Amino acid sequence: SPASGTSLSAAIHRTQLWFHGRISREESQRLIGQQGLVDGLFLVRESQRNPQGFVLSLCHLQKVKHYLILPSEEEGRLYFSMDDGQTRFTDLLQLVEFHQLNRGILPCLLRHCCTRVAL
Amino acid sequence: LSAAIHRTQLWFHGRISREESQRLIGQQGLVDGLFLVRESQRNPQGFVLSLCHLQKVKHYLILPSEEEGRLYFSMDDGQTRFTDLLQLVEFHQLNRGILPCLLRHCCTRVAL
Numbered sequence: 001s002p003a004s005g006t007s008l009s010a011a012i013h014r015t016q017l018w019f020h021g022r023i024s025r026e027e028s029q030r031l032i033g034q035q036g037l038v039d040g041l042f043l044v045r046e047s048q049r050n051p052q053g054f055v056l057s058l059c060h061l062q063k064v065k066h067y068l069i070l071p072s073e074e075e076g077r078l079y080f081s082m083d084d085g086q087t088r089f090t091d092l093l094q095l096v097e098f099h100q101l102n103r104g105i106l107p108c109l110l111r112h113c114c115t116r117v118a119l
Numbered sequence: 120l121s122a123a124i125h126r127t128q129l130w131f132h133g134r135i136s137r138e139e140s141q142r143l144i145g146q147q148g149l150v151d152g153l154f155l156v157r158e159s160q161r162n163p164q165g166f167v168l169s170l171c172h173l174q175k176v177k178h179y180l181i182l183p184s185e186e187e188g189r190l191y192f193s194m195d196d197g198q199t200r201f202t203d204l205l206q207l208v209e210f211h212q213l214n215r216g217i218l219p220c221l222l223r224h225c226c227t228r229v230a231l
Binding site: 017035036038039041111112113114115116117118 | 128129130148150151152205208209212213223224225227
């Protein structure tokens with residue numbers, strides 16, 4: 001189905017089911033709406049550029065809201081943060097686990113998926 | 120040396136009742152694909168997958184069998200087999216199989 005030359009590395013190294021790659025904002029709102037538009041439904045997607053990073057798309061008050069997750073580089077390592085480095089995470093998994101019980105800058109908690117295929 | 124160190128398999132609730140599973144799922148919104156796994160209230164070897172679909176909670180029995188003396192778990196009389204409950208749940212996050220919809224979010228366990 002994917003175009004010739006597409007990277008299949010996800011077969012080797014598992015990405016979470018809530019991680020959806022380079023889908024558009026509109027597509028993310030369609031997907032979340034399909035799951036019922038209840039508080040805490042979410043997915044994470046990639047922004048290739050402008051800014052380079054990820055987007056957490058989250059349902060709150062029956063609206064899908066979009067939060068930037070941005071990389072910083074310190075000492076040859078990357079860290080990820082939504083609040084300009086006040087709270088930092090080694091990867092998207094750690095960020096999601098934190099926000100399953102802490103709101104931080106988000107308006108509500110993220111829901112759990114609970115397994116190795118989806119946190 | 121303590122269950123507080125690393126709490127795993129939050130989708131598994133141990134010995135809670137059928138009624139409690141419905142209360143928990145209801146409190147969380149009756150969303151399609153919302154689920155948990157628990158022990159059967161009635162047979163000592165069984166487990167139950169409690170899953171919400173179309174605003175109704177349905178309960179699917181998971182039973183142990185042996186093949187060549189090796190153990191597996193199944194909801195469909197051994198047509199689809201799993202090494203453990205985790206493998207069964209992860210499979211049905213990708214394939215509906217005998218279920219009316221995919222497993223998506225879980226209710227997490229209240230006990231440690």
